[PDB]
Each structure stands twice: as C-alpha cells, then as structure tokens.
Nucleic acid binder design. Structure first.
Lengths: 592, 101, 78, 209, 147
RNA sequence: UUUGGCAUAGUUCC
DNA sequence: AAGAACAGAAACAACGGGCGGAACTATGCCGGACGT
DNA sequence: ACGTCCGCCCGTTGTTTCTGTTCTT
C-alpha cells in the first residue's frame, strides 16, 4: 500500500492515496503521448527525404535519380508487396523417413496403386520404365531442394511469404470440378511431372538466355519453384488432393495468371512506399528499444546509449558452468581496486624491526639472503574478491612486474595466513608524492584481467529460438539445444572474437560502426537489417521484408555508412536542388 | 594517460653506479650460466639450502637441486625464483603438518 | 527486339484513359459505336476494352533507349 | 606465456594459409590443416628462446595459373616496422624476383613506413596486416556473405548485359576488411552471393572504388 | 597525469562578476582569515572526522602560495569584468565584489565578514557531506524548494 | 469589389 | 656515439546546425523632439 | 508650418602534442 498497489477495483473505488498514486501513474501516459509525436514525425520525414526518388525502372532494376542501381530486382524477387501471402514449405521440417514416405510415390506395392490411381493407369505405371525413371528423378530433385532449403533456413522455420496460395488454389479446383476423394483418379503422374516442368518455364522474372540471365532467373525464382514442386509432387497429388486431368489443367492456368499478376509494375515509387511503411509503425512504437533505438540506427552514432555484445561459446564451455564462468572471468575488465581491501603508506626504514608486526617473519626471511628507500606501500587484498575471480597472488605479482619492471620491489604473503599482504618499495623527485602516484596508478590503471572497455558481463541461459543453437540430428529433424550465452556491456568485438574458446561465427554486437570497421559493408547491411527487424518486431508488428531491404540497401549502397542526416543526404552526388530542400538551403545553393 | 610512463621512467632514472657483473662458481645444476636475470651462485646455494632443509625436515640433496633448478628455469628473474622456492618450502611445511611424505 | 513487359501497368492505363477522355471531350472522333453513352471517361473505358484507343506508349529504358508499344499490343490486366 | 605465443603464431599462420587458398595460390591440404601439436612439433613448441622466432615462418607460394607469379608472407620481428626494414624486405623481393608480399605486424607501422610502402606500388605490392586482425577469419563469420572476384572479361560481359556504366554499380572501399582480405585494387568488381528470404538467392555486384 | 591523480578532488567557488573560478581557501583568506586552523574551524565543525579532514586537505594544498589578505584580494580581483591597468583599483574591486555581490542576504555592512565566512563554511561543509554520501542530494521538483 | 503585416496567448485533433 | 629540422598522425577544445503535423479564436503594436 | 538628428547531440576546424626519417659531426 505504501508504494502504490491499488487493491480496489474501479467499481469499489479508490482510497485517497490510491487515487493520488493512480493520477501519478496516468500522468506518465499523458506525457509519453504528448512527447512521442514530434519525434515520430521527424523520423518519417527524414526517411522520406532519404528515399524520395527511388523508383522501379522499365529495366526492372531499382535505381535512384542518378540511375545508380540499388537492387537488380525489387525485393530481391521482383514481386509487389500487396499480392503475396503467408505459406508453409512442408518439406523442410520432416525427418528423412517421414519425408521419403510422404514424397516418394511408391510404385511397387500396387495395392495403393489400384486404390488411388485408375486401372488403365496402374498397368501403364507398372509396365513402363521411362515413367519410373522420371518419378525417381523427381524425388531426387526434391531431395536436393530439401537440402537447399535447410541451408537457407536454419532454425527450422517453415512459415514463408510467397505470391501464389497453392493449397487454396487446389481446394478451389477440387470444389469447382466436383472432385470425389473416395474414388480412383484419371491423372497420370507423368502428366503431373511434365505439367509442373512446363509451368515453371512460364514464370519468368529475369528475361534472357545468356548464362548470366538464366542464373539470375533461377536465383529470382528458386524458393517459389521449390514450394511449387513440393506441393505438386505426384505422390501428394495421388494421395491427398486426388485431382483430375481438367482440374490439373485449370490449376496450372490459374497459377500462371496469379504469378503474372503479382509482378511489380515499373514506375512504382518503392522508396517512398518503404519510407512510409517503416515510419508509420513508429507512431505506435536491459537495453533501448523503440523510438530512441530507431533514432540511433537511422543516424548511426559511434557512442550508442547501451552497447552490448552477445557471445556464444564453442564447446564444453557452452554446457558445463565451469568453463562458462571461466570465460566470464576472462572477458570482464578488472583493475586492482576491484579486489583490494585497503592500502596505506608507512615509514619503515628498518628491514627487521617492521612497524607492522604481521609481516615480520616472511619479510625477515626475504631480507636475510640478498640501495633502497625507507618508505613503504603496504596494500591489503580482500579475500572474497581475491578468491571469486580465481586469481592468485603470484599472478598479481607478475602482473605488477610486467607493468612497472624491476625498478619496484614486491614481497607478498600467501593465502595460508588470514591476512594477505603486499609490500612495495622503490629499488624534486621526493618519495611520498611518488608513492601516492604509484598507488593511484596501480589502483586505477593496473588491468589485472579482462578486456578494456568491457565493463560488466552477464551469463544466462537463452529462452528464445533465435538465441539458441539449433542443429540437425542424424535422422534429419531439428533439435533445439540450450547452451550458455553471454551478454556484456561495452563493445570490443575483435578481441572477444580472437579470444580462445569463443565461437568466431555466431558472436555478434549491436554497434553498427563496430560491425562496419571489423567485418566490412555486407556484414553491416545484414546486421542493420537484423537490428531493424528486432526493434520493429519487439511490438509484435509485421512489416514486409522488401521495405527493410530497400532501406538497408539505400543506407549502405555507396560502400560507407550513410547516416540519414544532412551529412548523409548532402554526401550524395545529386543535384543541388534536392539537397537545398533538406536541413541546408542557402549554404548548399551558395556552395554550388 | 601515456604521459604517466614518461613521468614514471624519469622518476626511476632519478631514483648513477654501474650494474654488478655475474661471477661463476657448486652443487646446483647449470650454476655457471649467467642467463637467469639478476642471478648469483650465493642466491642459488641459498635457495638449494632452503629446499634441502624442507626436504630433510619432511624426511636427498638431488631433490633440493631439482626444485631450485626447475624454479630458476620457470621464473622470469632470480628475485621471483627465490620467492617461488620459499613458496615451495611453505607447501612442504603444510605437507609435514599434514604428516605427508 | 523488345524486352519490356507485355502487360499495361496501372500508371499507363490511368494516363491513357485520362488522355483519351480529354481527347473525346475536345470533340474528336471515336473508334467505337457508342450505344447511348455520353461521359467521355465511360467512352474512353469502352474504347480501351475494345482495343481501339489510338495511342502508342513510349517507354524509356534507363540507358537512354526507348520502345514504342501500341495499346493494341499490350495485355490489359485490369 | 610460451603456450599463448605458440597459439597466436599458429592461428596467424592458419589464417594466412586460408587467405592464400582464397586468393587462388597453391596451398596443400596438409598445410591448410595443421593441429596445434603438429605445429609445435614441426616448428618449435617453445617460442621464447626457441626455434620459432617470427622468422623461418615466411611463406613463399606460387599462383595456380602462373608459377612465375609468387607471393611472400613476411613476419617482422619488430613491434614497429621501420623504413630500413621495409627496404630490406624490398631488397629480398627484388633479389628473389617476387612482385607481391604480405607483412604481418606485431603492433603497427609508422606513417613514414606506410607511405614508403605506397610509393613503390607499380614496382612492388606490399600489404600490412596487424597481428590482431588475423587471429580470426572474417570470411567465416556468418554475417559475411560469399565474395567472388570477377575477371575483366566477366565485368565487361556484365556491363554489356545490363547496359551499365561502372559509376552505376554499388561500391566497396579499398580499405574494407574483406577487400583487404582478397587483395583487391581500385577498378575491380566483386560479386556477392547470399541467400535471400524472399527469393532464395540473390547475386549483387560491388565496384572497388 | 601524476599530480592531478594524486590530488583527486579540489573545491572551487564561482563568485559572481568574476571571470573564472577561484579556489575556496583563496576566498577565505581574502575574507581575512590566515591560519589553516581557523579556516578549518569555520569549515569542519567536529575535528574528529579524519575522512572530512582528508577530503579538505587537497583544497588547503592550494594555499601553499597565497598567505595574505592583500595578495588574496589581488588574485580575486585580477579577473574582474574589466581587468584594471593598476593594482590598487583591482584590489578595491575585489573587496567591493566580496562585500556587495557575494552572499548579499547575510549582510552588506562593513563588519559582515565574520558571518559571511561562517555561511561560506556552511556551504563547503554541506558540499563535503554530499560528497561523503551522508545527506541526500536535493531535487528541483520538490515543492518545498519552490516559490 | 476590393485585400495591411509582426509578435504573444489560449483551444481542437492525433 | 649525438644533435637538429621536418613531417605524419592523433587528443583535446571550440564552433555551428539541428530539433511535428494540421486547424481555430483573441489581443497588442507598427519611433521620439524640437523652434525657426 | 515644415524639416533635421538621434536544453542536449554530434559533425567541422584549430590548437597543440607526440613520435619517425634523414642529414650532419
């Protein structure tokens, strides 16, 4: 009750303290509503100015006002956004045995043949050999497509967005032609195979006959052709759908018509479309997400508000907590102040008669078997922090020797005694002021362990299917594994990647400038797309991938990061009249 | 700042007489070698006598020379080699307190 | 050798319809027998359906070239 | 430590072997795949006061299309490589009749040395790689799609097919990490092959400029 | 650097109508107090506080040079709105500022130094208490701190 | 059947 | 074994431009003194 | 009765500093 938990409902009413606390709660909502609007409008305006003149040319390429290629095919496939639908691939997830049983078309049992295919067709199937060779080649092609799919889509996601809804088209064909599923059909599986092969030739995105053009078309229609073959497999047609001749012909005609209608029309203003599509969710939008994150990603800064670096471990460190904690120790910065307990500066010229009575025995043992200055620098190390990081006094001593050379002296006790003692002596320029500078440097500059600029490192098991490692078993399924993943504060990507027992493939940060300077421009494009997808989908919202790809390509087209500001807008070699209308009019005009 | 290293090394030059040379002998292995930084025959015999006293109290001079020569080979400078020999003497002292051979 | 798409895009359809309607409204001959219609936009749509609009669309490729497609030759999608 | 220094030398050597294999030079499978113990045995498990002294690890290898065109991989023993070291290396290249060479640096090179490397560009080609930049292979990172260097015959065919002037392609800086990995000069065009979410594959092109 | 690293924290005062900052001991001396014992009587009320004494020590280490009221006033007045070409006028300007624009609410008469010193010592003492984590920092949105 | 502007304040809608 | 002049690269400090979209009422103000 | 004088971020550019080269003694 003291900190504001309203026990009553709106029907019973609120006691005065709960009334005031509720008003304090609602004020925050009013403030956020009145605050987000201007920033959202400004972000949308900047995006529109950035991509206002990007168009789809009659060449089918996507070019800006200076005829510089942005995408060779819009959305990497050449289709329009408003004509595509969610669909499932249905050949990626099934195991080996299930996949073979569902897509093989056994022509040997012959009782399933008599039950599903007609009598005049079963004799043909059992007699011919060219038919059998074609039917085996079809399954070979499907297996190769399955492997390609598993490479393209790790983590086993079937859901995909493709232009023609094949299952609903099949349902419509069944209802239109009054197909009875309880009777054998008159569809020849060879007719099915030949029809699909001929159909795939009429779905042309890249027109040409050179090897380059044929390769471009294959890349442009690979996924849809894989889906088409998976759906119109002959065994699936014979078992599940049970179509007929005229039904199959109508289905092929409808597929051609819909694919041809779902192709992007030249002249579209895809740049402005993408700007609006990515900026309209902004008005409804321990790290930063939402409007501030979008602002940072659009105008890239070298100092993000909450830099982070998710780290994946390679082997037994991923499972066993021992090496996990060991890597956690290796990757976290730690100076001497993090472990020291207390320090003091004494005046003790006598090696034997020591002002401090604790060090007597071992300091005498050290001095008995051999100038120097009479002053001292006695420090005391906290036992809890000393033993937490698995540190050793010999390690601290050798680090001090490396850091200062042999112009210092160091004598240290061991963990046997309850008091762990380090004693330092030097082997204008007066001693006391020099020892205070030695202590101050040795406590804020020592860098015993860890990587500089890496402040704090967490260590927690993942709970999401994108931050988990997913493998493919020997039986072909997808199995999800839980392995320890780290999450640091502060970024230094190169050192963490170079560290022993750290996975150099899946390790990633969220600083775009760092990704650039370490991995190039294509990696920065992919990472920028992933960060934008994460910030957009945190709210559960959906935005078509074409708009994300267009924004990322526009930002990373010229080889260096182009922040969407006056700097990036005027860096383009465009006409002065486009730049004058944006964040700098008179200066640009007078320069030109 | 990197100005600290310049300040520090200036103050240590201002801390000159010449560094003392090595002199060859001794029961210790390789004791004629000048290669260990700041080492001497007297420091090696003092460490060998410490190892021999600890092994004799636990109980032979061969084991004492092996512990000294191993530690003088592994340590960065003779001042750390002597401190690590005294650390091995303290570990033998915990073994004798535990009654272990 | 023409490589541009054989369909008439929505923008080409809109501009052709607007220009043909303006031409009709400026007292120009029609290429179809109007069955009672009087609105220039309706007559232009009827002509487009009949494939009798006498316009050739000049499509500019980005490399400076161009292609002339008659309305009769372009598949009318919508 | 000696173990850590051996590990760093081994990792640098392995990455350079992978780099040469990608650049088309002729590196055998056994050279490509060496275990840490095998490297310890072959060239010293003790670096400090041991056989591997950042020398004798230099690699001379011949391109698969021309045994006459060969490349060096030098390991300076100095944390700051200098003008005289660069002159020594260029003298060795001149006497061995070698055009191209790599130089892995402990910490860095002075700007004078870098400019003295740039000056002899038509005479000789030398590249600087830091010790930290080679402990990992940036190409193997999953964020980095496959890059293919395109010949000037394919660039011409591509330009003719799309009717593009080279100004109209996307660009990639000559200081890019992958560009330095492949050793690409200005005017060459790289090809990017990456899988796609909406098409299944997408081939882009970048101009080094 | 070495000297800044050893000093750590120093206490400075931004007097009005003065070009830049002034160390606090300089102002206290300009008020007419010379002995470190007296200045610490004005600032640290209970001398059995070694942490407070150590915190104020680097501020007193800036008094190694200045030791007299005349030179302290000169140092203060050197940084006026219009620096003078003479020295007596600068010293008179320094005294005028310390008598007219520094803490007007305590007093403006001739004998107000004995109370201005106490109030400035209280300001420094409260700053030390804030730095030691013994009192909560104020918030501007608290409505007792408004008019 | 002819045409003032600058500033400030309040309010409506996302 | 020493010294000087020059030059390339970098740390810190100061300066300048940038900051939502529409719409509707009302009220005050647009320079001051002077006498030949 | 007119006419004269009087509140926060981050891209540029400067200043200053710190090492490397080459010639000479």
């Amino acid at each position: 009750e003291s900190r504001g938990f309203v026990e009553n409902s709106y029907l019973a009413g609120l006691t005065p303290t709960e009334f005031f606390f509720h008003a304090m709660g609602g004020r925050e909502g009013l403030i956020d509503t009145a605050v987000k609007t201007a920033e959202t409008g400004y972000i949308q305006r900047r995006l529109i100015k950035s991509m206002e003149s990007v168009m789809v040319k009659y060449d089918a390429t996507v070019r800006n006002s200076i005829n510089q290629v942005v995408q060779l095919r819009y959305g990497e496939d050449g289709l329009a956004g408003e004509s595509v639908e969610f669909q499932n691939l249905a050949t990626l997830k099934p195991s080996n045995k299930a996949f073979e049983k569902k897509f093989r078309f056994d022509y040997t049992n012959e009782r399933a043949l008599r039950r599903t295919l007609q009598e005049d067709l079963v004799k043909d199937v059992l007699s011919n050999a060219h038919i059998q060779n074609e039917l085996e080649r079809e399954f070979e092609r499907m297996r190769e497509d399955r492997e390609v799919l598993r490479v393209i889509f790790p983590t086993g996601d079937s859901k995909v967005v493709l232009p023609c809804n094949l299952l609903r088209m099949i349902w419509n064909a069944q209802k239109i032609f009054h197909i009875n599923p309880r009777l054998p059909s008159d569809l020849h599986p060879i007719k099915v195979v030949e029809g699909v092969k001929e159909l795939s030739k009429k779905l042309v995105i890249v027109n040409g006959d050179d090897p380059l053009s044929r390769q471009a078309q294959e890349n442009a229609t690979l996924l849809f052709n894989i889906h088409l073959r998976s759906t119109l497999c002959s065994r699936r047609m014979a078992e599940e759908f049970r179509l007929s001749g005229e039904a199959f012909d109508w289905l092929l005609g409808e597929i051609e018509s819909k694919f041809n209608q779902a192709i992007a029309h030249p002249g579209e203003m895809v740049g402005a479309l993408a700007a609006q599509s990515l900026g309209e969710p902004a008005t409804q939008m321990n790290v930063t997400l939402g409007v501030p994150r979008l602002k940072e990603l659009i105008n890239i800064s070298k100092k993000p508000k909450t830099p982070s670096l998710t780290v994946f471990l390679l082997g037994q460190s991923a499972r066993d907590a021992e090496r996990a904690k060991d890597i956690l120790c290796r990757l976290e910065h730690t100076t001497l102040r993090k472990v020291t307990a207390n320090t003091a500066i004494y005046y003790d010229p006598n090696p034997q008669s020591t002002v401090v009575a604790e060090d007597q025995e071992w300091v005498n043992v050290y001095y008995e078997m051999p100038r120097i200055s009479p002053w001292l620098l006695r420090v005391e190390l906290d036992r809890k922090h000393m033993t937490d990081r698995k540190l050793t006094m010999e390690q601290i001593a050798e680090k001090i020797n490396a850091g200062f050379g042999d112009d210092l002296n160091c004598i240290f006790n061991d963990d046997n005694a309850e008091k762990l003692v380090l004693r330092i002596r030097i082997m204008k320029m007066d001693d006391d002021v020099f020892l205070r500078c030695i202590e101050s440097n040795m406590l804020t500059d020592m860098t015993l362990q860890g990587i500089e600029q890496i402040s704090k490192v967490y260590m927690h098991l993942p709970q999401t299917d994108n931050k988990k490692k997913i493998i493919i078993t020997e039986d072909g399924e997808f199995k999800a594994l839980q392995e320890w993943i780290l999450e640091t504060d502060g970024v230094s990507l190169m050192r963490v990647l170079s560290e022993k027992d750290v996975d150099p493939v899946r390790t990633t940060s969220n600083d775009i400038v760092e990704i650039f300077t370490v991995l190039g421009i294509e990696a920065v494009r992919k990472a920028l797309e992933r960060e934008l997808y994460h910030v957009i989908s945190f709210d559960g919202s959906y935005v078509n991938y074409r708009h994300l790809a267009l924004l990322c390509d526009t930002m990373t087209c010229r080889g260096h990061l182009m922040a969407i500001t006056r700097h990036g807008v005027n860096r383009q070699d465009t006409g002065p009249l486009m730049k004058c209308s944006f964040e700098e009019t008179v200066d640009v005009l007078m320069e030109a | 700042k990197r100005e600290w290293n310049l300040f520090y090394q200036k103050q240590m030059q201002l801390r000159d007489p010449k560094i003392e040379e090595f002199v060859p002998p001794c029961p210790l292995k390789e004791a004629s070698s000048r290669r260990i930084p700041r080492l001497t025959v007297k420091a090696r015999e003092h460490c060998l006598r410490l190892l021999e006293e600890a092994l004799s109290s636990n109980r032979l001079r061969a084991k004492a020379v092996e512990l000294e020569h191993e530690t003088f080979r592994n340590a960065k400078v003779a001042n750390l080699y002597k401190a690590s020999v005294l650390k091995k003497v303290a570990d033998i002292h915990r073994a004798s307190k535990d009654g272990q051979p | 050798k023409r490589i541009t798409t054989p369909y008439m895009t929505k923008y080409e359809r809109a501009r052709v319809l607007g220009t043909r309607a303006l031409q009709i409204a400026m007292c120009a001959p029609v290429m179809v027998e109007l069955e009672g219609e009087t609105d220039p936009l309706l007559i232009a749509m009827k002509e487009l359906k009949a494939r009798k609009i006498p316009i050739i669309i000049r499509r500019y490729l980005p490399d400076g070239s161009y292609e002339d497609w008659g309305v009769d030759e372009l598949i009318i999608t919508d | 430590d000696d173990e850590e220094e051996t590990y760093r030398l081994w990792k640098i050597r392995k990455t350079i072997m992978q780099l040469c294999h990608d650049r088309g030079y002729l590196v055998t499978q056994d050279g490509l795949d060496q275990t840490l113990e095998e490297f310890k045995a072959q060239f010293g498990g003790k670096p400090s006061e041991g056989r591997p002294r950042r020398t004798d690890l230099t690699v001379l290898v011949a391109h698969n299309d021309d045994p006459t065109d060969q490349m060096f991989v030098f390991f300076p023993e100095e944390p700051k490589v200098g003008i005289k070291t660069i002159k020594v290396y260029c003298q060795r290249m001149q006497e061995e009749n070698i055009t191209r060479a790599l130089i892995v640096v402990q910490q860095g090179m002075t700007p004078s040395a870098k400019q003295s490397l740039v000056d002899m560009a038509p005479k000789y080609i030398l590249e600087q790689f830091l010790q930290q930049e080679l402990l990992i292979n940036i190409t193997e990172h999953e964020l980095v799609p496959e890059h293919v260097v395109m010949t000037k015959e394919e660039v011409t065919e591509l330009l003719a097919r799309y009717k593009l002037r080279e100004n109209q392609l996307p660009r990639i800086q000559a200081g890019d990490p992958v560009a330095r990995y492949f050793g690409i000069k200005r005017g060459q065009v790289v090809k990017i092959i990456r899988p796609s979410e909406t098409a299944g594959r997408y081939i882009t092109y970048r101009l080094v400029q | 650097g070495a000297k800044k690293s050893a000093i750590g924290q120093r206490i400075v005062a931004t007097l009005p109508y003065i070009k830049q900052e002034v160390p606090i001991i300089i102002v206290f001396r300009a008020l007419g107090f010379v002995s470190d014992r007296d200045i610490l009587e004005h600032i640290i009320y209970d001398f059995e506080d070694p942490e407070m004494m150590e915190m104020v020590k680097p501020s007193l280490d800036e008094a190694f040079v200045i030791q007299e009221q005349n030179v302290a006033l000169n140092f203060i007045g050197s940084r006026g709105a219009k620096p003078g070409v003479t020295k007596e006028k600068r010293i008179k300007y320094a005294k005028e500022v310390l008598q007219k624009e520094m803490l007007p609410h305590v007093g403006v008469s001739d004998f107000c130094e004995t109370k201005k010193a106490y109030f400035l010592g209280y300001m420094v003492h409260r700053l030390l208490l804030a730095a030691l984590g013994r009192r909560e920092l104020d918030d501007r949105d608290h409505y007792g701190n408004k008019r």
